[PDB]
PDB file of C-alpha atoms and ligand atoms in Angstrom:
ATOM      1  CA  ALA H   1     -27.681  22.326 -26.780  1.00 45.29           C
ATOM      2  CA  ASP H   2     -24.716  19.764 -26.118  1.00 45.45           C
ATOM      3  CA  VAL H   3     -22.693  22.053 -23.965  1.00 44.90           C
ATOM      4  CA  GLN H   4     -25.641  21.615 -20.808  1.00 45.69           C
ATOM      5  CA  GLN H   5     -26.169  17.352 -21.858  1.00 45.39           C
ATOM      6  CA  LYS H   6     -22.302  16.681 -21.971  1.00 47.90           C
ATOM      7  CA  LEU H   7     -21.766  18.751 -18.502  1.00 48.43           C
ATOM      8  CA  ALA H   8     -24.437  16.653 -17.020  1.00 47.71           C
ATOM      9  CA  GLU H   9     -22.911  13.041 -17.967  1.00 47.05           C
ATOM     10  CA  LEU H  10     -19.725  14.712 -16.967  1.00 46.60           C
ATOM     11  CA  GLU H  11     -21.981  15.323 -13.203  1.00 46.37           C
ATOM     12  CA  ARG H  12     -23.417  11.754 -13.896  1.00 44.92           C
ATOM     13  CA  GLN H  13     -19.812   9.867 -14.656  1.00 45.54           C
ATOM     14  CA  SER H  14     -18.388  11.936 -12.090  1.00 45.12           C
ATOM     15  CA  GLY H  15     -20.953  10.883  -9.483  1.00 47.58           C
ATOM     16  CA  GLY H  16     -21.464  14.056  -7.659  1.00 48.82           C
ATOM     17  CA  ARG H  17     -22.990  17.490  -7.692  1.00 50.52           C
ATOM     18  CA  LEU H  18     -21.245  19.759 -10.783  1.00 46.56           C
ATOM     19  CA  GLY H  19     -22.094  23.934 -10.585  1.00 44.38           C
ATOM     20  CA  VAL H  20     -20.749  25.971 -13.111  1.00 41.37           C
ATOM     21  CA  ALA H  21     -20.684  29.521 -14.136  1.00 41.01           C
ATOM     22  CA  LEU H  22     -18.907  31.120 -17.627  1.00 38.61           C
ATOM     23  CA  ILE H  23     -18.664  34.407 -18.410  1.00 38.58           C
ATOM     24  CA  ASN H  24     -17.877  35.082 -21.790  1.00 37.54           C
ATOM     25  CA  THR H  25     -16.545  39.098 -21.441  1.00 34.52           C
ATOM     26  CA  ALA H  26     -16.305  38.857 -25.502  1.00 35.02           C
ATOM     27  CA  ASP H  27     -20.559  39.353 -25.598  1.00 34.72           C
ATOM     28  CA  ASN H  28     -20.923  38.973 -22.233  1.00 35.39           C
ATOM     29  CA  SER H  29     -22.788  35.484 -22.710  1.00 36.07           C
ATOM     30  CA  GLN H  30     -22.900  33.138 -19.825  1.00 37.76           C
ATOM     31  CA  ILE H  31     -22.800  29.294 -19.552  1.00 34.04           C
ATOM     32  CA  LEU H  32     -24.939  28.346 -16.580  1.00 35.36           C
ATOM     33  CA  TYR H  33     -25.365  24.680 -14.921  1.00 37.19           C
ATOM     34  CA  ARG H  34     -26.750  24.620 -11.464  1.00 35.72           C
ATOM     35  CA  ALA H  35     -25.311  27.877 -11.466  1.00 35.19           C
ATOM     36  CA  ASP H  36     -27.716  28.866  -8.682  1.00 32.59           C
ATOM     37  CA  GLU H  37     -27.421  26.163  -6.531  1.00 32.94           C
ATOM     38  CA  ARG H  38     -25.342  26.668  -3.377  1.00 31.78           C
ATOM     39  CA  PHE H  39     -21.775  25.099  -2.753  1.00 31.45           C
ATOM     40  CA  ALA H  40     -19.458  24.914   0.030  1.00 34.62           C
ATOM     41  CA  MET H  41     -17.175  27.803  -1.276  1.00 33.53           C
ATOM     42  CA  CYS H  42     -13.911  26.171   0.756  1.00 30.59           C
ATOM     43  CA  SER H  43     -10.443  27.840  -0.101  1.00 30.69           C
ATOM     44  CA  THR H  44     -11.872  29.779  -2.893  1.00 30.63           C
ATOM     45  CA  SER H  45     -13.586  31.983  -0.435  1.00 29.59           C
ATOM     46  CA  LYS H  46      -9.920  33.589   0.243  1.00 28.32           C
ATOM     47  CA  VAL H  47     -10.597  35.442  -2.828  1.00 29.89           C
ATOM     48  CA  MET H  48     -13.185  37.451  -0.878  1.00 30.80           C
ATOM     49  CA  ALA H  49     -11.335  37.476   1.940  1.00 28.17           C
ATOM     50  CA  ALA H  50      -8.670  39.282   0.641  1.00 28.84           C
ATOM     51  CA  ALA H  51     -10.466  41.696  -1.929  1.00 30.81           C
ATOM     52  CA  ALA H  52     -12.356  42.951   1.557  1.00 27.18           C
ATOM     53  CA  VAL H  53      -8.578  43.534   2.984  1.00 27.48           C
ATOM     54  CA  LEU H  54      -7.752  45.183  -0.037  1.00 28.54           C
ATOM     55  CA  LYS H  55     -11.175  47.642  -0.855  1.00 27.32           C
ATOM     56  CA  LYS H  56      -9.974  48.816   3.046  1.00 28.33           C
ATOM     57  CA  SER H  57      -6.667  49.699   2.066  1.00 28.90           C
ATOM     58  CA  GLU H  58      -7.892  52.032  -0.476  1.00 28.52           C
ATOM     59  CA  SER H  59      -8.633  54.396   2.587  1.00 32.24           C
ATOM     60  CA  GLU H  60      -6.187  52.926   4.671  1.00 30.21           C
ATOM     61  CA  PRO H  61      -3.128  54.188   2.326  1.00 29.83           C
ATOM     62  CA  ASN H  62      -0.739  51.505   3.640  1.00 31.48           C
ATOM     63  CA  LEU H  63      -2.925  48.737   5.390  1.00 30.34           C
ATOM     64  CA  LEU H  64      -1.411  45.945   3.252  1.00 26.91           C
ATOM     65  CA  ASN H  65       1.802  46.815   5.053  1.00 27.42           C
ATOM     66  CA  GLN H  66       0.851  46.975   8.473  1.00 22.36           C
ATOM     67  CA  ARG H  67       2.688  44.246  10.430  1.00 24.21           C
ATOM     68  CA  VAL H  68       0.191  40.897  11.911  1.00 23.08           C
ATOM     69  CA  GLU H  69       1.901  39.009  14.748  1.00 22.78           C
ATOM     70  CA  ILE H  70       2.288  34.482  13.821  1.00 21.30           C
ATOM     71  CA  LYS H  71       1.926  32.574  16.693  1.00 20.28           C
ATOM     72  CA  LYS H  72       2.278  29.107  17.183  1.00 20.25           C
ATOM     73  CA  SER H  73      -0.930  29.163  18.651  1.00 21.82           C
ATOM     74  CA  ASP H  74      -1.948  29.998  15.267  1.00 24.83           C
ATOM     75  CA  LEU H  75      -1.032  27.413  13.354  1.00 26.95           C
ATOM     76  CA  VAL H  76      -3.815  24.904  11.795  1.00 27.93           C
ATOM     77  CA  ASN H  77      -3.854  21.921   9.348  1.00 29.14           C
ATOM     78  CA  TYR H  78      -2.265  23.820   6.792  1.00 30.60           C
ATOM     79  CA  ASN H  79       0.903  26.045   6.946  1.00 33.69           C
ATOM     80  CA  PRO H  80       3.057  26.138   4.710  1.00 33.68           C
ATOM     81  CA  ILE H  81       4.376  30.172   4.769  1.00 34.22           C
ATOM     82  CA  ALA H  82       3.077  31.197   8.276  1.00 35.51           C
ATOM     83  CA  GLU H  83       5.138  28.707   9.784  1.00 35.50           C
ATOM     84  CA  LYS H  84       8.028  29.959   8.701  1.00 36.14           C
ATOM     85  CA  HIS H  85       7.409  33.172  10.982  1.00 35.56           C
ATOM     86  CA  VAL H  86       5.989  31.631  13.753  1.00 38.09           C
ATOM     87  CA  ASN H  87       6.675  34.551  16.724  1.00 38.92           C
ATOM     88  CA  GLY H  88       7.485  36.979  13.992  1.00 39.25           C
ATOM     89  CA  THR H  89       5.159  39.402  11.717  1.00 42.86           C
ATOM     90  CA  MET H  90       3.457  39.184   8.210  1.00 41.86           C
ATOM     91  CA  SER H  91       2.226  41.971   6.217  1.00 38.87           C
ATOM     92  CA  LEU H  92      -0.874  42.285   5.063  1.00 39.35           C
ATOM     93  CA  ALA H  93      -0.066  41.717   1.877  1.00 39.14           C
ATOM     94  CA  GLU H  94       2.375  38.395   2.713  1.00 39.00           C
ATOM     95  CA  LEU H  95      -0.650  37.334   4.779  1.00 39.22           C
ATOM     96  CA  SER H  96      -2.737  37.704   1.242  1.00 39.86           C
ATOM     97  CA  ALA H  97      -0.468  36.793  -1.162  1.00 41.71           C
ATOM     98  CA  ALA H  98       0.450  33.754   1.006  1.00 44.82           C
ATOM     99  CA  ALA H  99      -3.695  32.380   1.089  1.00 45.47           C
ATOM    100  CA  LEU H 100      -4.464  33.031  -2.314  1.00 42.96           C
ATOM    101  CA  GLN H 101      -1.249  31.276  -3.874  1.00 45.91           C
ATOM    102  CA  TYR H 102      -0.848  28.216  -1.427  1.00 46.79           C
ATOM    103  CA  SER H 103      -3.814  28.527   0.254  1.00 45.01           C
ATOM    104  CA  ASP H 104      -2.474  29.156   3.436  1.00 43.74           C
ATOM    105  CA  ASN H 105      -4.957  28.988   6.137  1.00 44.36           C
ATOM    106  CA  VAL H 106      -3.143  30.787   8.918  1.00 47.28           C
ATOM    107  CA  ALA H 107      -3.047  33.323   6.441  1.00 45.58           C
ATOM    108  CA  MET H 108      -7.039  33.061   5.639  1.00 44.52           C
ATOM    109  CA  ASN H 109      -7.819  33.407   9.776  1.00 42.11           C
ATOM    110  CA  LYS H 110      -5.451  36.834  10.252  1.00 44.02           C
ATOM    111  CA  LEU H 111      -7.205  38.397   6.742  1.00 46.10           C
ATOM    112  CA  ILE H 112     -10.437  37.690   7.910  1.00 46.52           C
ATOM    113  CA  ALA H 113      -9.246  38.888  11.609  1.00 45.22           C
ATOM    114  CA  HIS H 114      -8.982  42.461  10.144  1.00 45.84           C
ATOM    115  CA  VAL H 115     -11.712  42.856   8.363  1.00 47.57           C
ATOM    116  CA  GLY H 116     -14.116  42.368  11.064  1.00 52.24           C
ATOM    117  CA  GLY H 117     -14.960  38.407  11.190  1.00 50.49           C
ATOM    118  CA  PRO H 118     -16.624  36.791   8.575  1.00 46.98           C
ATOM    119  CA  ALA H 119     -20.231  38.233   8.763  1.00 44.77           C
ATOM    120  CA  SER H 120     -17.850  40.941   7.843  1.00 42.88           C
ATOM    121  CA  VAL H 121     -16.836  39.874   4.739  1.00 43.40           C
ATOM    122  CA  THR H 122     -20.039  39.058   4.048  1.00 42.65           C
ATOM    123  CA  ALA H 123     -20.738  42.703   4.212  1.00 41.54           C
ATOM    124  CA  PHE H 124     -18.259  43.106   2.122  1.00 42.51           C
ATOM    125  CA  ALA H 125     -20.152  40.872  -0.905  1.00 42.67           C
ATOM    126  CA  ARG H 126     -23.530  42.945  -0.023  1.00 45.33           C
ATOM    127  CA  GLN H 127     -21.899  46.636  -0.563  1.00 41.26           C
ATOM    128  CA  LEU H 128     -20.550  44.422  -4.054  1.00 44.68           C
ATOM    129  CA  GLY H 129     -23.841  43.668  -4.630  1.00 46.60           C
ATOM    130  CA  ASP H 130     -23.401  39.873  -3.655  1.00 46.07           C
ATOM    131  CA  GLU H 131     -26.784  38.997  -2.246  1.00 48.22           C
ATOM    132  CA  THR H 132     -25.512  35.192  -2.144  1.00 49.61           C
ATOM    133  CA  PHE H 133     -22.314  34.891  -0.585  1.00 49.67           C
ATOM    134  CA  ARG H 134     -22.193  34.152   3.201  1.00 46.33           C
ATOM    135  CA  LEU H 135     -18.577  33.342   4.911  1.00 43.57           C
ATOM    136  CA  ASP H 136     -19.498  31.978   8.412  1.00 42.43           C
ATOM    137  CA  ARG H 137     -16.605  30.356   9.754  1.00 43.95           C
ATOM    138  CA  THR H 138     -13.209  30.550  10.696  1.00 46.63           C
ATOM    139  CA  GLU H 139     -10.336  28.348   9.514  1.00 45.97           C
ATOM    140  CA  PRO H 140     -10.074  25.410   9.065  1.00 48.32           C
ATOM    141  CA  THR H 141     -14.187  24.277   9.831  1.00 48.71           C
ATOM    142  CA  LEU H 142     -15.342  26.408   6.862  1.00 48.48           C
ATOM    143  CA  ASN H 143     -14.414  23.388   4.729  1.00 44.61           C
ATOM    144  CA  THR H 144     -16.532  20.454   5.530  1.00 44.73           C
ATOM    145  CA  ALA H 145     -18.782  21.202   2.507  1.00 46.22           C
ATOM    146  CA  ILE H 146     -22.017  19.535   4.953  1.00 41.48           C
ATOM    147  CA  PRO H 147     -24.782  18.925   2.183  1.00 39.47           C
ATOM    148  CA  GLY H 148     -27.650  20.867   2.632  1.00 37.26           C
ATOM    149  CA  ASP H 149     -25.860  23.010   5.083  1.00 38.59           C
ATOM    150  CA  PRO H 150     -25.870  26.749   3.932  1.00 38.38           C
ATOM    151  CA  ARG H 151     -22.850  28.173   5.838  1.00 41.89           C
ATOM    152  CA  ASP H 152     -19.785  29.752   4.162  1.00 41.66           C
ATOM    153  CA  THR H 153     -21.818  29.206   0.483  1.00 40.22           C
ATOM    154  CA  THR H 154     -22.112  30.710  -2.746  1.00 40.73           C
ATOM    155  CA  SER H 155     -23.632  29.807  -5.440  1.00 37.33           C
ATOM    156  CA  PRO H 156     -21.691  29.787  -8.978  1.00 36.10           C
ATOM    157  CA  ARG H 157     -23.413  33.117 -10.838  1.00 37.44           C
ATOM    158  CA  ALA H 158     -22.502  35.147  -7.733  1.00 37.45           C
ATOM    159  CA  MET H 159     -19.217  34.242  -7.566  1.00 40.37           C
ATOM    160  CA  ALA H 160     -18.376  34.478 -11.176  1.00 38.87           C
ATOM    161  CA  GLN H 161     -20.252  38.082 -11.642  1.00 41.11           C
ATOM    162  CA  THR H 162     -17.791  39.112  -8.233  1.00 39.91           C
ATOM    163  CA  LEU H 163     -15.518  37.664  -9.179  1.00 41.55           C
ATOM    164  CA  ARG H 164     -15.743  39.778 -12.817  1.00 40.14           C
ATOM    165  CA  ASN H 165     -16.646  42.747 -10.689  1.00 38.51           C
ATOM    166  CA  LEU H 166     -12.941  42.562  -8.388  1.00 39.62           C
ATOM    167  CA  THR H 167     -10.378  41.316 -10.943  1.00 38.08           C
ATOM    168  CA  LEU H 168     -12.511  43.311 -13.796  1.00 39.21           C
ATOM    169  CA  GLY H 169     -14.632  45.474 -13.385  1.00 39.49           C
ATOM    170  CA  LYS H 170     -14.356  48.592 -10.695  1.00 37.66           C
ATOM    171  CA  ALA H 171     -15.212  47.208  -7.275  1.00 35.61           C
ATOM    172  CA  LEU H 172     -11.550  48.330  -6.493  1.00 37.58           C
ATOM    173  CA  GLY H 173      -9.310  50.803  -7.710  1.00 36.65           C
ATOM    174  CA  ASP H 174      -7.133  50.376  -9.846  1.00 35.09           C
ATOM    175  CA  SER H 175      -4.368  49.370  -7.862  1.00 36.12           C
ATOM    176  CA  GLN H 176      -5.660  47.177  -6.011  1.00 35.35           C
ATOM    177  CA  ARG H 177      -7.730  45.222  -8.736  1.00 35.73           C
ATOM    178  CA  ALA H 178      -4.094  44.518 -10.111  1.00 34.60           C
ATOM    179  CA  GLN H 179      -3.007  43.440  -7.133  1.00 38.40           C
ATOM    180  CA  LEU H 180      -5.663  40.518  -7.111  1.00 38.45           C
ATOM    181  CA  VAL H 181      -4.440  39.779 -10.455  1.00 37.88           C
ATOM    182  CA  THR H 182      -1.182  39.545  -9.598  1.00 36.80           C
ATOM    183  CA  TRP H 183      -1.421  36.899  -6.692  1.00 35.90           C
ATOM    184  CA  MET H 184      -4.212  34.827  -8.631  1.00 34.40           C
ATOM    185  CA  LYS H 185      -1.944  34.651 -11.562  1.00 36.75           C
ATOM    186  CA  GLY H 186       0.335  33.386  -8.746  1.00 36.26           C
ATOM    187  CA  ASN H 187      -1.182  30.493  -7.394  1.00 35.93           C
ATOM    188  CA  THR H 188       0.735  27.204  -7.153  1.00 35.57           C
ATOM    189  CA  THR H 189      -2.378  25.007  -6.008  1.00 37.30           C
ATOM    190  CA  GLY H 190      -4.305  25.386  -9.590  1.00 41.19           C
ATOM    191  CA  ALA H 191      -2.022  23.233 -11.875  1.00 41.98           C
ATOM    192  CA  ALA H 192      -4.851  20.688 -12.128  1.00 40.85           C
ATOM    193  CA  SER H 193      -8.363  21.986 -11.478  1.00 38.22           C
ATOM    194  CA  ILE H 194      -9.398  24.446 -14.377  1.00 38.07           C
ATOM    195  CA  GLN H 195      -5.830  25.351 -15.927  1.00 39.00           C
ATOM    196  CA  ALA H 196      -5.663  21.662 -16.869  1.00 40.12           C
ATOM    197  CA  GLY H 197      -8.892  22.096 -19.491  1.00 41.48           C
ATOM    198  CA  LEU H 198      -7.863  24.411 -21.107  1.00 40.61           C
ATOM    199  CA  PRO H 199      -4.624  24.596 -23.959  1.00 38.71           C
ATOM    200  CA  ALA H 200      -1.426  25.341 -22.409  1.00 39.04           C
ATOM    201  CA  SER H 201      -0.958  28.655 -23.622  1.00 37.74           C
ATOM    202  CA  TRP H 202      -3.193  30.328 -21.888  1.00 40.13           C
ATOM    203  CA  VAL H 203      -2.726  33.075 -19.502  1.00 37.96           C
ATOM    204  CA  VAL H 204      -5.122  31.455 -15.806  1.00 35.17           C
ATOM    205  CA  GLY H 205      -6.045  33.811 -12.301  1.00 31.80           C
ATOM    206  CA  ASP H 206      -7.649  30.944 -10.369  1.00 32.10           C
ATOM    207  CA  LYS H 207      -8.202  30.402  -6.485  1.00 31.91           C
ATOM    208  CA  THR H 208      -8.859  26.223  -6.027  1.00 28.85           C
ATOM    209  CA  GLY H 209     -10.914  25.446  -3.089  1.00 31.18           C
ATOM    210  CA  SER H 210     -11.174  21.804  -1.643  1.00 34.47           C
ATOM    211  CA  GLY H 211     -13.008  20.395   2.044  1.00 37.29           C
ATOM    212  CA  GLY H 212     -15.078  17.266   3.099  1.00 39.81           C
ATOM    213  CA  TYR H 213     -17.825  15.165   1.596  1.00 39.17           C
ATOM    214  CA  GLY H 214     -14.952  15.154  -1.941  1.00 40.68           C
ATOM    215  CA  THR H 215     -15.251  19.271  -2.779  1.00 42.19           C
ATOM    216  CA  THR H 216     -13.212  20.058  -4.776  1.00 40.14           C
ATOM    217  CA  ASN H 217     -13.769  24.167  -6.811  1.00 42.72           C
ATOM    218  CA  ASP H 218     -11.991  26.254  -8.640  1.00 40.12           C
ATOM    219  CA  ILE H 219     -12.550  30.473  -9.601  1.00 40.52           C
ATOM    220  CA  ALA H 220     -10.430  31.319 -12.389  1.00 41.59           C
ATOM    221  CA  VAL H 221     -10.301  34.386 -15.056  1.00 40.06           C
ATOM    222  CA  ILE H 222      -8.851  33.689 -18.226  1.00 39.82           C
ATOM    223  CA  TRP H 223      -6.610  35.570 -20.281  1.00 37.10           C
ATOM    224  CA  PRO H 224      -6.361  33.273 -23.747  1.00 33.56           C
ATOM    225  CA  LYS H 225      -4.418  34.283 -26.682  1.00 31.80           C
ATOM    226  CA  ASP H 226      -5.803  36.704 -28.771  1.00 31.50           C
ATOM    227  CA  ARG H 227      -9.241  36.696 -27.200  1.00 26.94           C
ATOM    228  CA  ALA H 228     -11.140  38.768 -24.459  1.00 26.47           C
ATOM    229  CA  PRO H 229     -11.177  37.328 -21.285  1.00 29.56           C
ATOM    230  CA  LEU H 230     -13.799  34.510 -19.217  1.00 32.91           C
ATOM    231  CA  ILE H 231     -14.638  34.297 -15.627  1.00 33.86           C
ATOM    232  CA  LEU H 232     -15.346  30.875 -14.969  1.00 33.80           C
ATOM    233  CA  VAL H 233     -16.499  29.269 -11.496  1.00 37.55           C
ATOM    234  CA  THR H 234     -16.500  25.415 -11.237  1.00 33.29           C
ATOM    235  CA  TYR H 235     -17.614  23.908  -7.724  1.00 29.27           C
ATOM    236  CA  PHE H 236     -17.982  19.967  -7.484  1.00 29.32           C
ATOM    237  CA  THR H 237     -19.019  17.754  -4.168  1.00 28.58           C
ATOM    238  CA  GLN H 238     -20.074  14.707  -3.136  1.00 28.22           C
ATOM    239  CA  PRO H 239     -22.368  12.679  -1.213  1.00 26.99           C
ATOM    240  CA  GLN H 240     -20.064  10.823   0.906  1.00 26.16           C
ATOM    241  CA  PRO H 241     -17.978  12.547   3.675  1.00 26.66           C
ATOM    242  CA  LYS H 242     -14.509  10.519   2.911  1.00 28.70           C
ATOM    243  CA  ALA H 243     -14.361  11.145  -1.070  1.00 24.08           C
ATOM    244  CA  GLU H 244     -11.146  11.816  -2.330  1.00 26.01           C
ATOM    245  CA  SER H 245     -10.885  15.246  -4.109  1.00 21.54           C
ATOM    246  CA  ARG H 246     -11.139  15.454  -8.037  1.00 19.39           C
ATOM    247  CA  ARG H 247     -10.075  18.391  -9.421  1.00 19.99           C
ATOM    248  CA  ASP H 248      -9.972  16.401 -13.235  1.00 19.46           C
ATOM    249  CA  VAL H 249     -13.705  17.132 -12.498  1.00 21.35           C
ATOM    250  CA  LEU H 250     -13.030  20.648 -12.702  1.00 25.27           C
ATOM    251  CA  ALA H 251     -10.217  20.157 -15.591  1.00 25.12           C
ATOM    252  CA  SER H 252     -13.125  18.077 -17.833  1.00 25.85           C
ATOM    253  CA  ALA H 253     -15.854  21.175 -16.797  1.00 26.04           C
ATOM    254  CA  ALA H 254     -13.639  23.654 -17.913  1.00 24.39           C
ATOM    255  CA  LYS H 255     -12.809  21.700 -21.403  1.00 24.47           C
ATOM    256  CA  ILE H 256     -16.472  21.571 -21.663  1.00 24.13           C
ATOM    257  CA  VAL H 257     -17.372  24.924 -21.528  1.00 22.92           C
ATOM    258  CA  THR H 258     -14.490  26.529 -23.314  1.00 24.42           C
ATOM    259  CA  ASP H 259     -14.627  23.736 -27.119  1.00 28.04           C
ATOM    260  CA  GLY H 260     -15.329  26.330 -29.362  1.00 30.11           C
TER     261      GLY H 260
HETATM  262  C1  LIG I   1      -9.110  25.585   0.516  1.00 27.73           C
HETATM  263  O1  LIG I   1      -9.933  24.996   0.893  1.00 27.73           O
HETATM  264  C2  LIG I   1      -7.873  24.576   0.049  1.00 27.73           C
HETATM  265  N1  LIG I   1      -7.233  24.330   0.845  1.00 27.73           N
HETATM  266  C3  LIG I   1      -7.489  24.076   2.749  1.00 27.73           C
HETATM  267  O2  LIG I   1      -7.939  24.793   3.190  1.00 27.73           O
HETATM  268  C4  LIG I   1      -6.009  23.178   3.512  1.00 27.73           C
HETATM  269  N2  LIG I   1      -7.567  22.652   4.794  1.00 27.73           N
HETATM  270  C5  LIG I   1      -5.730  22.561   3.217  1.00 27.73           C
HETATM  271  C6  LIG I   1      -5.061  22.752   2.007  1.00 27.73           C
HETATM  272  C7  LIG I   1      -3.614  22.052   0.619  1.00 27.73           C
HETATM  273  C8  LIG I   1      -3.689  20.817   1.578  1.00 27.73           C
HETATM  274  C9  LIG I   1      -4.303  20.323   2.705  1.00 27.73           C
HETATM  275  C10 LIG I   1      -5.081  21.166   3.153  1.00 27.73           C
HETATM  276  C11 LIG I   1      -6.826  24.893  -0.590  1.00 27.73           C
HETATM  277  N3  LIG I   1      -5.939  24.691  -0.481  1.00 27.73           N
HETATM  278  C12 LIG I   1      -4.812  23.624  -1.975  1.00 27.73           C
HETATM  279  C13 LIG I   1      -3.777  23.672  -2.361  1.00 27.73           C
HETATM  280  O3  LIG I   1      -2.398  23.198  -1.456  1.00 27.73           O
HETATM  281  O4  LIG I   1      -3.874  21.856  -3.096  1.00 27.73           O
HETATM  282  C14 LIG I   1      -5.991  22.970  -2.158  1.00 27.73           C
HETATM  283  C15 LIG I   1      -6.110  22.260  -4.451  1.00 27.73           C
HETATM  284  C16 LIG I   1      -6.330  22.047  -1.663  1.00 27.73           C
HETATM  285  S1  LIG I   1      -7.195  23.679  -2.104  1.00 27.73           S
END
């Protein structure tokens, strides 16, 4: 009864709205906090786009090797990897890595493009039993996280279940699941979010997200030493539109729900 008491003060002291879903695969217990409220996904949505492509590749053998042109026109606000390939190409594999590991926003757009637009990414979620996920826009506007808006949202519960299906279950074939885990395990943007609330010794594969209204999110699969893995989704959003990011809130939330 404490664990939920502690998350609620974190929420107060942090002055925001906090969503949490933990899945302990050791006994399939869950910890839920507003786990059925909608939250602007922001970049944590890149995991579903990369997954949708991977799924496709299972019936398009070398889909991951198809070349995709990067045009100067394509660049948006955050383009750390694509910017190096303008008037060149990137493979779908390279765009998946870049989207997942550096949060490259051109890469996402390319992923969205090659599955059929945001509605079909959503359609892929439905294929997975996720009836909550909805991708409605492209980069960069899908990060507005305006309150009460439902575009580009999901619920902590639905995305932890989905992320377990994708990284540990059988949503993807063995090869594609392994690729997603290696990509996520290779994220460079997560060191201050879920990760910072765990023992430094644990292995983490995570995808951060951030957007307007101070919205700071992270979604992770976690392999502690000598334990069964966890799936943890932390979503955090704030009232004022200009609020600064609070990755530390995700770290505290992870700390609270992993204590014990
Ligand atoms: C997903 O929201 C998020 N960021 C973006 O989509 C960009 N608009 C952006 C990224 C980085 C800096 C500035 C803007 C992922 N990018 C991660 C990062 O590199 O720090 C993140 C933690 C900002 S999330």
